[PDB]
DNA sequence: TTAAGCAATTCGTAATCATGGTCATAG
DNA sequence: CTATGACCATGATTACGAATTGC
């Protein structure tokens, strides 16, 4: 018997805001350890990994480990029915096929229940190779967000090439091309770069887009780059865990 | 009950009482008894041993949008 | 089963010679027909098959008899433990088997239909044979006899009754039976199809069954055996399409000068006649070679092919043409001398059958899914048909021209891949039809036989709107002054509107075209769409039909016919539409805007239910388009600004669970003010009482008068004056007329009654 | 000669905002006592009671009792040509089969607008008079987020109303859910229950009666066994605004 | 085992793309 | 208590299938 009690429930909400449009249906993982899951997209272009682990929850507990197959739109749209300020609780029946959403508004007055109907998935699953990477950039995600908005008028691909001084993003179309160049400074508004190999990898804006979704979740965000393999694009859930992006590049 | 039913379902459709699927059973009651064809006192006493009922007080097609 | 009747004659005879009926229960008897009874099913079933194993008749008619009446027989005896039914045929020791087939093609589309086994009979379900000739709006037994003659659980009281009832029921089971016997004899049904039986070598039972295919390859193997020829077997899956007919471009608008039309008459059978085009002597690309004799021994097409001259080979499918084109010629010349205006439509629909078999095997060449295809001579026909037409075109604009004498140099507006309708110039018909004649047989010399061009008709005035859309007045000669419209393509042939909106647009096209009037039509649309938005307008007039087709391009995407039908009733989960008939509906007032298919009805529904109707639906997507369409090209764009302000002089004008508990507030009758009290009139509106008094009264004066005529035609209708009407025909407008007339009259009724008695009652 | 001078246009703006997506064509009684307005929906399914009191007005006058069939969206429309802080003033003529809104822009300009009236024979409906076991009082924002909530759940909602609260619930292919509301100014909720009822409605028609949201900063609900549901938005000193809706039975 | 062809116009539904009204929070 | 763009909501454009008629 599964519960998790969550007094931010926004995070919930900022959470599938961000994984609807890029998956349908995903598996979540749930143990003592906490919420996990990790699912391609539809495309089979990427991989998202979440990571809700139970010290983060204000209220953990988990009897039988369990594998929730959940329609993230179905759960999207069942979580806006949340105030961004409302208590929420996760608590699933180890037995039964479906998952309960209850929502307490801070003054108590009103409380919200859902039940969620589940449903069995064979969804195919992957591991991820643990490497290690010639580029890490921190930056806030707002920037990155507007860096991907803004290319994506230029063009469908980003080419991310990163030196010793800083990073760039260009890309071309129709209407010309253009790049953004970013160099590293000297707590949520610098850029950090690690680079210990000039990388140049090409990817494309649309799935950039997608994480960028994500940028509720974090004040910053982290991109991990290295020759030929996929780019990792990482939002960290204060205290809860986090939201990694795998995105394969063009070759 | 449902042997009074099939009484006056047989009432409804002897033709030497007169054409009636405009109007109430016991008006044409009387009708006939007026210009005194032959009714019969037995569509009577079942016409007065009830309430205003609809299933008795009524023609066979008083549905139907004829 | 409780009463089956019969009709018999032999044939030639003006009318029947037997007349029978059998019933369940003791009847009364009828004059002029024979009556017996039975008091169970066993004996009435037996007795029927006995009946038909003496009568021994040829062949067996009806209206759907195929796919109700015969299984339900054999069903029902099944049941029942009667072993001597189902053995109704001519062989002695052999029963009856019901089993299912399907045909479908791109003609009539695809039917599925049951068969019940008959060896030495005939069977001619009348149902089929106007479901394969005929392109109707409803296919039921009131309405094809309407539109050619002019015409469940009461049933079930009328046979628990008395035997007076019961005679009452074999009069009109009688009367159904005898309706599909009048309709075969009056069509010439049954001489048509012995004479295609006898022109085209097939039996009479593939005239029921088939297709047009059976036809043409029993024709070309009844030619094939005279010179000693074989055919082969081709089967591909498959080719591609070749390219099919040339349309020329319009100068669209509004004509007032005369256009003539000039056509050619049997175009691609006389193509495949006069070239020498056959599969016995296509030539292939390389048999010509090495000789090289090119003149007068082979031609060449424009899509490419050579093909061999006819002083080497004749051709088979040139003479299996010539026979089937004398024999429509005795057709015609045999039409020629009738008076009788639907006999004279039926030998059209004669000489209709002849010439659509003398193109259907033209067609036979090009279908890559068939028996034997050769794309190769399709390909030569129309490739012939567009250079013929091309050079029509170009020799008439050229030849009448001011400096060649004549009066005015002519201008083609339209042709249509067999006619041509030239613009001459002067506005006196007879000098249109003396030219047209001249142009006509002037343009014929420029072929080889029998290639020619003809007159067919002046136009005058025209009215040309888009490609296969357009309207005109027909002349035949000049003193036969005109003869009727002509509507192609327009919104008044077509079967996927209402009838409000074609009979809308006929009646424009009579006030626009006969009497020159467009200040009459503005009023007649104006009144139309002022009478649509105050609520006085027929259910009749708002009913929409739609064909259910197969069931997988509807499952492809949502409509509403498709939704209404797959929607069972409550009622009835044995009675709903199947795949191939006509679903008619009609659209009610809601607020989902996103889906017309969730807004659609069952008429009856409508009736026993009391649903409201969405006049802007009506107004803005089936009446304003069309409208738009035709008034238009005489004006500029403040016609369309006048329609849509004769709407707007015209659109102010609007007639009006929780409704149970009502509160029915009174209102003054002259200035529409709620007040406390049932009097009628206001107290400031009071002075003037007499006139509104007055006004109203000649209100009720009419609807009384409506209801006396609708509610004695039923009468007349129905036969009696002395008994009951029960008529619920739904192809009827004279029902749910009848109705309506009912309420109106008991609220204007109920209104006069607010202003006192006009004197007492009771001295 | 009718004329009405509202110094809080706004209001005139907001109550359009609530009618005209549920009524296409409605008629107004203006008479000495004010303006009032009762028409059934397209659907004939509910029913809108609007009442200005003549008081509310800053300056009211009607000679004759005149009453035009309005194009809500027409004079929708219209209205959107308002400030939210112009004087509005509704002027007719027993004569004129035209209404005339003239906005008054606070500090050098005049809107006048003339609106085209029209004849309509609208069905018009007595309500009954009667008695309700439940009355909610309630945040208006608060129903109106229950409403688009659960309509993203299922069409239709129940509404269970206890002893100690009330309850909202819908169901449909993404499973089910309900929302609470407990007892405890116009933050609180309180509840009138003489009756334990049980009620289903449409939310597609509650999503319309919530477009009145603005017009006041709470909304009491009234049901009853078997009879249609109501609900009603006050126009402080105006008036209201009452929408009643038909249960699914 | 069974089925004649191509050209063209009209209308409805879902999806794609533009634009404004609230709102939420950093200054 | 007040600017700014991010967010929800509603309307304009395009695409394609179905139906039906003219040659
Ligand atoms: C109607 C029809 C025409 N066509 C082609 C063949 C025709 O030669 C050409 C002309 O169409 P039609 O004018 O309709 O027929 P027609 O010219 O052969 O005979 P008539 O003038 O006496 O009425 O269109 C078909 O292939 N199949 C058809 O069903
Ligand atoms: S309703 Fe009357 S007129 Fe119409 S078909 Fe029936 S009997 Fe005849
Ligand atoms: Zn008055």
Same mark, same amino acid.
């Given at each position: 018997?599964?519960?998790?009690?969550?007094?931010?429930?926004?995070?919930?909400?900022?959470?599938?805001?961000?994984?609807?449009?890029?998956?349908?249906?995903?598996?979540?993982?749930?143990?003592?350890?906490?919420?996990?899951?990790?699912?391609?997209?539809?495309?089979?272009?990427?991989?998202?990994?979440?990571?809700?682990?139970?010290?983060?929850? &204000?209220?953990?507990?988990?009897?039988?480990?369990?594998?929730?197959?959940?329609?993230?739109?179905?759960?999207?749209?069942?979580?806006?029915?949340?105030?961004?300020?409302?208590?929420?609780?996760?608590?699933?029946?180890?037995?039964?096929?479906?998952?309960?959403?209850?929502?307490?508004?801070?003054? %108590?007055?009103?409380?919200?229940?859902?039940?969620?109907?589940?449903?069995?998935? &064979?969804?195919? %699953?992957?591991?991820?190779?643990?490497?290690?990477?010639?580029?890490?950039?921190?930056?806030?995600?707002?920037?990155?967000?507007?860096?991907?908005? &803004?290319?994506?008028?230029?063009?469908?691909?980003?080419?991310?090439?990163?030196?010793?001084?800083?990073?760039?993003?260009?890309?071309?179309?129709?209407?010309?091309?253009?790049?953004?160049?970013?160099?590293?400074?000297?707590?949520?508004?610098?850029?950090?770069?690690?680079?210990?190999?000039?990388?140049?990898?090409?990817?494309?804006?649309?799935?950039?887009?997608?994480?960028?979704?994500?940028?509720?979740?974090?004040?910053?965000?982290?991109?991990?780059?290295?020759?030929?393999v996929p780019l990792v694009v990482e939002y960290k859930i204060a205290d809860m865990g986090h939201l990694k992006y795998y995105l394969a590049p063009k070759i | 009950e449902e042997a009074e039913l099939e009484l006056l379902r047989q009432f409804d459709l002897a033709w030497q009482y007169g054409p009636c699927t405009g109007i109430t059973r016991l008006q044409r009651w009387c009708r006939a008894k007026q210009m005194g064809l032959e009714p019969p006192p037995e569509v009577w006493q079942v016409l007065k041993t009830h309430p205003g009922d609809p299933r008795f007080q009524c023609s066979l097609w008083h549905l139907y949008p004829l | 089963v409780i009463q089956i009747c019969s009709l018999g004659l032999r044939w030639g005879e003006p009318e029947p010679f037997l007349r029978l009926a059998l019933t369940l229960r003791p009847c009364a008897p009828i004059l002029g027909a024979k009556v017996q009874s039975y008091e169970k099913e066993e004996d009435l079933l037996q007795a029927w098959s006995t009946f038909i194993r003496i009568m021994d008749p040829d062949v067996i008619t009806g209206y759907n008899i195929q796919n109700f009446d015969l299984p339900?027989?054999?069903?029902?005896?099944?049941?029942?433990?009667?072993?001597?039914?189902?053995?109704?045929?001519?062989?002695?020791?052999?029963?009856?088997?019901?089993?299912?087939?399907?045909?479908?093609?791109?003609?009539?589309?695809?039917?599925?239909?049951?068969?019940?086994?008959?060896?030495?009979?005939? $069977?001619?379900?009348?149902?089929?044979? =106007?479901?394969?000739?005929?392109?109707?709006?409803?296919?039921?037994? #009131?309405?094809?006899?309407?539109?050619? =003659?002019?015409?469940?659980?009461?049933?079930?009281?009328?046979?628990?009754?008395?035997?007076?009832?019961?005679?009452?029921?074999?009069?009109?089971?009688?009367?159904?039976?005898?309706?599909?016997?009048?309709?075969?004899?009056?069509?010439?049904?049954?001489?048509?199809?012995?004479?295609?039986?006898?022109?085209?070598?097939?039996?009479?039972?593939?005239?029921?069954?088939?297709?047009?295919?059976?036809?043409?390859?029993?024709?070309?193997?009844?030619? /094939?055996?005279?010179?000693?020829?074989?055919?082969?077997?081709?089967?591909?899956?498959?080719?591609?399409?070749?390219?099919?007919?040339?349309?020329?471009?319009?100068?669209?608008?509004?004509?007032?000068?005369?256009?003539?039309?000039?056509?050619?008459?049997?175009?691609?059978?006389?193509?495949?006649?006069?070239? #020498?085009?056959?599969?016995?002597?296509?030539?292939?690309?390389? +048999?010509?070679?090495?000789?090289?004799? +090119?003149?007068?021994?082979?031609?060449?097409?424009?899509?490419?092919?050579?093909?061999?001259?006819?002083?080497?080979?004749?051709?088979?499918?040139? $003479?299996?043409?010539?026979?089937?084109?004398?024999?429509?010629?005795?057709?015609?010349?045999? =039409?020629?001398?009738?008076?009788?205006?639907?006999?004279?439509?039926?030998?059209?629909?004669?000489?209709?059958? *002849?010439?659509?078999?003398?193109?259907?095997?033209?067609?036979?060449?090009?279908?890559?899914?068939?028996?034997?295809?050769? *794309?190769?001579?399709?390909?030569?026909?129309?490739?012939?048909?567009?250079?013929?037409?091309?050079?029509?075109?170009?020799?008439?604009?050229?030849?009448?021209?001011?400096?060649?004498?004549?009066?005015?140099?002519?201008?083609?507006?339209?042709?249509?891949?067999?006619?041509?309708?030239?613009?001459?110039?002067?506005?006196?018909?007879?000098?249109?039809?003396?030219?047209?004649?001249?142009? /006509?047989?002037?343009?014929?010399?420029?072929?080889?036989?029998?290639?020619?061009?003809?007159?067919?008709?002046?136009?005058?005035?025209?009215?040309?709107?888009?490609?296969?859309?357009?309207?005109?007045? *027909?002349?035949?000669?000049?003193?036969?002054?005109?003869?009727?419209?002509?509507?192609?393509?327009?919104?008044?042939?077509?079967?996927?509107?209402?009838?409000?909106?074609?009979?809308?647009?006929?009646?424009?096209?009579?006030?626009?075209?006969?009497?020159?009037? @467009?200040?009459?039509?503005?009023?007649?649309?104006?009144?139309?769409?002022?009478?649509?938005?105050?609520?006085?307008?027929?259910?009749?007039?708002?009913?929409?039909?739609?064909?259910?087709?197969?069931?997988?391009?509807?499952?492809?995407?949502?409509?509403?016919?498709?939704?209404?039908?797959?929607?069972?009733?409550?009622?009835? @989960?044995?009675?709903?539409?199947?795949?191939?008939?006509?679903?008619?509906?009609?659209?009610?007032?809601?607020?989902?805007?996103?889906?017309?298919?969730?807004?659609?009805?069952?008429? *009856?529904?409508?009736?026993?239910?009391?649903?409201?109707?969405?006049?802007?639906?009506?107004?803005?997507?089936?009446?304003?388009?069309?409208?738009?369409?035709?008034?238009? @090209?005489?004006?500029?764009?403040?016609?369309?600004?006048?329609?849509?302000?004769?709407?707007?002089?015209?659109?102010?004008?609007?007639?009006?669970?929780?409704?149970?508990?009502?509160?029915?507030? #009174?209102?003054?009758?002259?200035?529409?003010?709620?007040?406390?009290?049932?009097?009628?009139?206001?107290?400031?509106?009071?002075?003037?009482?007499?006139?509104?008094?007055?006004?109203?009264?000649?209100?009720?004066?009419?609807?009384?008068?409506?209801?006396?005529?609708?509610?004695?035609?039923?009468?007349?209708?129905?036969?009696?004056?002395?008994?009951?009407?029960?008529?619920?025909?739904?192809?009827?407008?004279?029902?749910?007329?009848?109705?309506?007339?009912?309420?109106?009259?008991?609220?204007?009724?109920?209104?006069?009654?607010?202003?006192?008695?006009?004197?007492?009652?009771?001295?």
């Amino acid at each position: 018997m599964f519960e998790a009690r969550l007094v931010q429930g926004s995070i919930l909400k900022k959470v599938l805001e961000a994984l609807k449009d890029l998956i349908n249906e995903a598996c979540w993982d749930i143990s003592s350890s906490g919420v996990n899951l990790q699912s391609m997209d539809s495309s089979h272009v990427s991989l998202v990994q979440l990571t809700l682990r139970s010290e983060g929850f &204000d209220t953990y507990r988990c009897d039988r480990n369990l594998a929730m197959g959940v329609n993230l739109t179905s759960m999207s749209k069942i979580l806006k029915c949340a105030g961004n300020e409302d208590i929420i609780t996760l608590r699933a029946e180890d037995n039964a096929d479906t998952l309960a959403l209850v929502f307490e508004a801070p003054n %108590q007055e009103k409380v919200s229940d859902y039940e969620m109907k589940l449903m069995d998935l &064979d969804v195919e %699953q992957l591991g991820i190779p643990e490497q290690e990477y010639s580029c890490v950039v921190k930056m806030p995600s707002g920037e990155f967000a507007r860096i991907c908005r &803004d290319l994506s008028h230029i063009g469908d691909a980003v080419v991310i090439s990163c030196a010793k001084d800083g990073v760039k993003f260009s890309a071309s179309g129709e209407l010309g091309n253009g790049n953004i160049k970013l160099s590293q400074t000297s707590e949520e508004e610098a850029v950090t770069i690690e680079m210990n190999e000039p990388v140049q990898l090409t990817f494309a804006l649309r799935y950039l887009n997608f994480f960028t979704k994500a940028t509720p979740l974090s004040s910053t965000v982290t991109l991990s780059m290295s020759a030929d393999v996929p780019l990792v694009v990482e939002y960290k859930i204060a205290d809860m865990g986090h939201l990694k992006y795998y995105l394969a590049p063009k070759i | 009950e449902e042997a009074e039913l099939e009484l006056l379902r047989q009432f409804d459709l002897a033709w030497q009482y007169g054409p009636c699927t405009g109007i109430t059973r016991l008006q044409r009651w009387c009708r006939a008894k007026q210009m005194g064809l032959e009714p019969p006192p037995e569509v009577w006493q079942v016409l007065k041993t009830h309430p205003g009922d609809p299933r008795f007080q009524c023609s066979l097609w008083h549905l139907y949008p004829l | 089963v409780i009463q089956i009747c019969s009709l018999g004659l032999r044939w030639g005879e003006p009318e029947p010679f037997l007349r029978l009926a059998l019933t369940l229960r003791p009847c009364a008897p009828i004059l002029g027909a024979k009556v017996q009874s039975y008091e169970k099913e066993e004996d009435l079933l037996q007795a029927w098959s006995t009946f038909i194993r003496i009568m021994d008749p040829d062949v067996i008619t009806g209206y759907n008899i195929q796919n109700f009446d015969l299984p339900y027989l054999i069903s029902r005896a099944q049941t029942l433990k009667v072993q001597t039914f189902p053995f109704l045929g001519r062989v002695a020791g052999l029963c009856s088997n019901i089993r299912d087939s399907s045909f479908q093609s791109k003609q009539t589309g695809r039917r599925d239909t049951k068969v019940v086994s008959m060896v030495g009979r005939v $069977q001619m379900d009348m149902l089929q044979v =106007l479901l394969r000739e005929y392109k109707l709006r409803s296919y039921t037994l #009131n309405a094809v006899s309407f539109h050619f =003659l002019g015409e469940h659980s009461i049933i079930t009281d009328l046979q628990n009754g008395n035997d007076q009832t019961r005679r009452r029921l074999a009069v009109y089971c009688l009367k159904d039976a005898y309706l599909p016997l009048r309709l075969l004899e009056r069509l010439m049904v049954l001489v048509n199809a012995v004479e295609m039986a006898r022109v085209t070598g097939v039996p009479l039972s593939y005239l029921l069954s088939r297709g047009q295919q059976v036809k043409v390859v029993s024709q070309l193997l009844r030619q /094939a055996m005279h010179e000693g020829l074989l055919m082969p077997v081709v089967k591909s899956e498959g080719g591609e399409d070749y390219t099919g007919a040339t349309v020329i471009e319009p100068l669209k608008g509004y004509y007032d000068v005369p256009i003539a039309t000039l056509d050619f008459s049997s175009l691609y059978p006389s193509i495949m006649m006069a070239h #020498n085009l056959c599969y016995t002597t296509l030539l292939r690309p390389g +048999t010509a070679q090495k000789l090289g004799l +090119t003149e007068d021994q082979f031609i060449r097409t424009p899509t490419g092919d050579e093909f061999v001259k006819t002083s080497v080979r004749k051709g088979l499918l040139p $003479q299996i043409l010539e026979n089937l084109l004398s024999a429509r010629k005795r057709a015609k010349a045999e =039409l020629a001398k009738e008076t009788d205006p639907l006999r004279r439509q039926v030998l059209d629909g004669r000489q209709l059958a *002849l010439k659509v078999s003398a193109n259907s095997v033209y067609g036979f060449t090009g279908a890559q899914v068939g028996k034997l295809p050769c *794309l190769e001579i399709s390909q030569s026909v129309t490739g012939f048909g567009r250079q013929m037409i091309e050079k029509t075109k170009q020799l008439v604009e050229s030849k009448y021209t001011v400096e060649n004498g004549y009066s005015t140099s002519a201008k083609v507006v339209y042709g249509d891949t067999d006619s041509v309708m030239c613009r001459f110039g002067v506005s006196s018909v007879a000098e249109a039809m003396a030219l047209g004649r001249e142009a /006509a047989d002037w343009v014929s010399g420029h072929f080889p036989s029998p290639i020619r061009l003809e007159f067919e008709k002046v136009y005058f005035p025209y009215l040309l709107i888009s490609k296969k859309r357009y309207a005109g007045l *027909l002349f035949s000669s000049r003193p036969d002054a005109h003869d009727r419209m002509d509507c192609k393509g327009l919104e008044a042939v077509r079967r996927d509107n209402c009838p409000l909106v074609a009979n809308l647009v006929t009646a424009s096209l009579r006030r626009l075209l006969i009497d020159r009037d @467009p200040e009459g039509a503005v009023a007649h649309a104006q009144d139309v769409i002022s009478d649509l938005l105050c609520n006085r307008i027929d259910i009749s007039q708002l009913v929409i039909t739609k064909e259910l087709t197969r069931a997988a391009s509807d499952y492809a995407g949502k409509q509403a016919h498709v939704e209404l039908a797959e929607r069972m009733r409550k009622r009835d @989960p044995g009675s709903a539409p199947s795949l191939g008939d006509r679903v008619p509906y009609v659209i009610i007032s809601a607020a989902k805007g996103v889906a017309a298919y969730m807004k659609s009805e069952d008429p *009856l529904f409508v009736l026993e239910h009391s649903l409201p109707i969405d006049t802007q639906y009506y107004l803005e997507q089936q009446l304003a388009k069309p409208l738009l369409r035709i008034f238009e @090209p005489i004006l500029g764009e403040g016609r369309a600004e006048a329609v849509l302000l004769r709407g707007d002089h015209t659109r102010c004008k609007t007639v009006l669970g929780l409704l149970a508990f009502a509160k029915r507030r #009174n209102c003054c009758i002259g200035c529409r003010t709620v007040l406390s009290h049932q009097g009628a009139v206001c107290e400031f509106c009071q002075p003037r009482e007499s006139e509104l008094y007055q006004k109203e009264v000649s209100h009720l004066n009419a609807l009384e008068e409506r209801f006396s005529r609708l509610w004695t035609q039923c009468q007349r209708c129905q036969g009696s004056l002395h008994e009951d009407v029960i008529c619920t025909s739904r192809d009827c407008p004279i029902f749910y007329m009848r109705k309506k007339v009912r309420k109106d009259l008991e609220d204007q009724e109920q209104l006069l009654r607010r202003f006192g008695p006009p004197g007492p009652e009771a001295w």
